Symmetry: C5
Subunit: 331 residues, 5 copies
């Protein structure tokens, strides 16, 4: 549903999401020499991989299938509290370190331009033995470049173990926030136009909309930085002075992303005061126009009114040009 | 608000609340095999349970009955300073660890929609031997799902000891803040309508009212996070590498709740500036309308006035349509 | 008053106060069995008490008598730097722990309602041997309930030693901040009326006045929290696992008072923006009234003016009622 | 001027603005006797380096970089320190070297009525039995300290050179109280003009004061850190001797910081108070326009339809007093 | 030119910059005795210098030449992750310490006055053995004074080793921020003119522009302080109690720069509210002018209108001077 699933016992596997469309399993098992890869929708087929001596990346898509999550969960010996965190998708990103596995929760965003609105999808990962278990809400992810790298043997991914695969997955995900930040920079640039130039009713709507989107963004990003901070200065089954430099590089991007997001909160928050000033000033002009038209034709209509002749007209042009050369000392 | 109860000695048991309606004791004593449960209003009947070898949940409702709190207090060996903390309900949530008992104070909120106003109830808990003493201000709580779990033997609560009962009750209370958060989100959504759309006198009232409610909400939630932080990374008679994972899960929700509350403070604080801009932009129109009507009929009334003929009327139509085709360059 | 007392040597006893009215000494010496109490204005009479084996509370009122403070100071062996801190009354509250005495400086406030203005008095205390030396600026304090408790043997104060007397004195003073907070809450409640309802010139005065008063209040309360924090987690001649729980209870109120004060800063800071919005929105009405009256009687006065007949009056009523049934589509 | 770029680390440039005067001034003293003189020949003060009795060498006019160099080398002061002496745009600070303490402070001047504040840097070096002092321009706050050595007041003559350093820092810190007093006056004057004399130059002074307060805070906060460091640290500062004295300056330092925060806070609101005073006058100016408008608009119209007589005047007084008794329902 | 370079393996050397114009290498190898210096565009010629026993400063300009960076990188044994950080030009400044080298990334700014806009260039440094490798985007730097010092044997740079050269290069770069800060102080001084004096549409543009520039500036300066904080209290191959005092001096400038940047954020952020008030008040005055002209010539045009004689004119002068001596009680 949404943020209530109340009075249920601790271990209860409920998908609180909204995507119940697809379901797919996808394995990739690889070594320095060779690699295999397949999709199935039968779970019992991927369970043997728990015991590979070679890296495997099991990617379960469509976790609305709580049955499936439970089965994989029990088989790999994952705590029910963890499985529950997998299936509840309104949640702090986070990392927890257990005996024989690392658990990570991350968000993966989408921004629709022009209908200025942003959705997220939760991704969970579990490193354990030679496996990276991945859990997703819906088909469509940012991990495609990583598949190619295993498939077409690019980079060093094939030489390296399962922890480096975790790295590689996290790095693909963090990098995507750069795409997202670029799109948001464009809305900001568009919006600081309308503000001091197209003053309007729907212009104020979009400002607030962006501010709101930024707050949501900040809410994910700051714990995301903490995730990567934790992965970097910590380290159990992450082959150490080996992969640690790589986590640190993602940690760095994380810090960059956080900084850029603060920068936007900052720029945007002033934006309304810029609009307020653009409009109060458009008021000032309307006022001046009213006031000069008023200030000449008020006495002129008065002296023409005291009745009850080209010397009246002449006084009417004298006190009319001493107005206009007084609104040459302001206006 | 009874925020004063001054010049009384440290040990003094005064209920500073406002609920003096009901009174009830309710025991639930349980084990893996069987369970018993009853209500009474005679205190002497519950005191034997102090020495159970099996988990017990004594729940005393209506702590306006200071005499009752004193008796239970003294019998379980609870410090007078703690008993006074129980009866005084204007207070930081908190945890205090003593020799043979943990003491906890929490708040439990109620939001009345439409009459946009929020009340709270304090709940105190004392874990000690195999007991969870609970103290409440008035009938009606969030612990109902927990009773069913003991009654109908759901979950694992019956296999686990008194500390897990503590957990289970806190967990039930923390979860309720999610209900409350959802209701507040709705007011926020409703309010960012009226602000940029139904500009009004009572609209500004509700904004402030919400802001106020948010501040009160923040005041409780932040120390609440600290309560659950303390329970998690600490631990005396809380069967350790057993129940600790559970408190941690509540700790997490606490962090989520905190985060969500900052997000509302943030969104709402801007809401007045959104209103300001919605209104400064409106005034502008009333001004333009006044100014065009002014600016044509000011000189037209003047030249018609300098007379005190269809060539006058013709000049009056020429300088009237050169106005209207100049407010086609703005307005 | 006052505030500079420059280029004087370190040890210099100047009263920088403003109260030079009264002077009084008042002793209360007590034990489990019996108690004595008296007032004097002769100092040499109180000095023997330094060597009681029983708790004594010497209360010197009117420290403008720097001579007296010096005498008592030297006799109990109190550092001249401390005596100077006693007599200088613009000053962070604080605690300083010396060899054979604790020194404490606190403020004690008065809020005059209706003439919305707040004064304070400084109170100093020195625990040393079996004495609590108290120093005050002017007659009238909050310690009256404490006298009663010694006099009429209430509570446990008579069983306990001098440190518990210090506690009692501090506890009485902190509790008075509750009184003061309640009075401030009332001004806030009254002020958030005038803001969105009686918009006015003197209304803005009171807001600022209150904000100012709150800043002054925050300035004292935050270091007050630090005083009590320090007394609680520290402890020399404070009979330990005895009186510590009691300091801890004051510590708790201190935190509550701090929290409440932040809450007011928060609430009040928005209050001007509420007024701004209440006025920017009214201006609107005054504008519309001007604009309707303007917009009908501008052209009506023009056509009646083109003349220098019940078909003129009929056109004047037709275009007058097509206005009013157009301000039935707004206004 | 704070550019002096691409010069090697050791470069002695005076980046100040005061090149007027130059003077040396020694005061050497002991418990028994004291000598003091002025010179402008440096070689005369260098012998003092080896006193067994406290000396206070005060060099005024450090635009004389040659002099600073000579004293520097002779006392064995690192060129990096010497450069910090001559560069006057700089965080106040304390640096502890092998055989000396180095301290940099600011010393302010506020000119009332031309609401503007200048500073002068003071450096100090404690080393052996010397306190070297370096100033930009004649005129300092140290006069009371000279008298105390001259006229053997206080205890300065009994105590060593570290107590002299204290005495000098204490004199300088105290001066900030003078400066804070003067600033409190501007604040009190300004919160008049804001809600009472609304004006163009009123807004100027607000900003000006805000700016002054930011510069002030910039110096005061590191100043607190200087004194914090001197207090809880201590090498050649005769310990449980002079430590109490540094601590007392430390306290003033904290009081000064707290008072400055109080002003930042008070003043920051001050513009919103002005905004509200004006948006409201707007309201009044509006009402006045609107009543005058609303009666004399129709009255000028009916007198205009011609083209009756004390029956028109009577209708003109009726619809004129039904206005005024309608602006008895608002206004 | 973006910040997306997505789905590429960790080690990938892409120049994400925008300057592809020049390319140059420039070595300076020096010792106490003598020095050599040359430019080349052939890389293989500089590689031998890796093994100098004497300090060398290799400065590669035009890192768009990724091939060159790769070659120097591998030969000096620099990790591909660092190389990638060299070529990626959008990036937290930072320091990373590896086995046999220190890596540092810094920015180097340019402010164009009058077209109020600021660009930056990245500079990377690697201290390794007796080399400082420097990497730049485009010809033109701040390091010229440092070349002179080696060339014309000034300062102590020739006596000192490679770590002092690093210091010298970082010190040159940090110093330039003072130039940049001076230029920005000028815009602020100019802008707080236009705000309270030349109120205008393009005046608000520049304010925002400057705020934006400040935020970007702050983004670089803060991690910059962290860079130099890290170099100072850390230290591997930086000859310790030797060069550390020097890094500390840069550290200090860094702190100063940060403090100055906060000061500007602070000053500038209020600048819009100053403009708002300067304009709302130009509203207030325009209003008063309209309202006095209105308020006299409204009734005067009415009584001259009631028809249908020097006693009419006399009443018209009486009620015209009782207005003007009523706008001597306000206005
Ligand atoms: Cl790779
Ligand atoms: Cl359960
Ligand atoms: Cl008591
Ligand atoms: Cl050098
Ligand atoms: Mg749950
Ligand atoms: Mg009490
Ligand atoms: Mg969980
Ligand atoms: Mg605002
Ligand atoms: Mg003093
Ligand atoms: Mg308590
Ligand atoms: Mg330098
Ligand atoms: Mg320096
Ligand atoms: Mg003191
Ligand atoms: Mg990459
Ligand atoms: Mg990188």
């Amino acid at each position: 549903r949404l943020s209530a699933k109340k009075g249920l016992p601790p271990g209860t596997l409920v998908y609180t999401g909204k995507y119940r469309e697809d379901f797919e399993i996808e394995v990739m098992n690889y070594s320095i020499e060779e690699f295999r890869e397949f999709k199935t929708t039968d779970v019992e087929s991927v369970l043997p991989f728990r015991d590979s001596s070679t890296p495997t990346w099991i990617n379960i898509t469509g976790i609305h299938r709580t049955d499936v999550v439970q089965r994989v969960g029990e088989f790999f010996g994952i705590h029910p509290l963890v499985l529950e965190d997998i299936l509840n998708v309104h949640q702090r990103p986070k990392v927890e370190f257990f005996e024989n596995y690392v658990f990570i929760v991350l968000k993966m965003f989408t921004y629709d331009k022009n209908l200025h609105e942003l959705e997220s999808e939760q991704v969970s990962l579990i490193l354990t033995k030679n496996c990276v278990l991945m859990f997703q809400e819906k088909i469509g992810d940012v991990f495609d470049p990583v598949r190619e790298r295993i498939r077409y043997n690019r980079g060093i991914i094939r030489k390296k173990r399962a922890d480096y695969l975790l790295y590689s997955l996290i790095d693909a995900l963090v990098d995507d926030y750069f795409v997202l930040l670029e799109k948001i920079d464009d809305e900001i640039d568009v919006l600081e136009e309308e503000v001091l130039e197209r003053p309007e009713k729907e212009t104020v709507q979009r400002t607030h909309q962006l501010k709101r989107n930024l707050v949501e963004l900040r809410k994910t990003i700051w714990p995301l930085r903490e995730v990567l901070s934790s992965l970097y200065r910590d380290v159990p089954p992450l082959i150490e002075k080996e992969t640690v430099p790589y986590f640190r590089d993602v940690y760095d991007h994380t810090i960059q992303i956080a900084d850029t997001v603060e920068t936007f909160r900052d720029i945007v928050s002033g934006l309304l005061d810029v609009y307020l000033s653009s409009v109060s000033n458009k008021t000032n002009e309307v006022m001046k126009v009213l006031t000069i038209i008023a200030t000449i034709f008020m006495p002129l209509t008065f002296i023409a009114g005291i009745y009850g002749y080209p010397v009246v007209l002449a006084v009417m042009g004298v006190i009319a040009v001493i107005m206009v050369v007084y609104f040459k000392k302001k206006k």
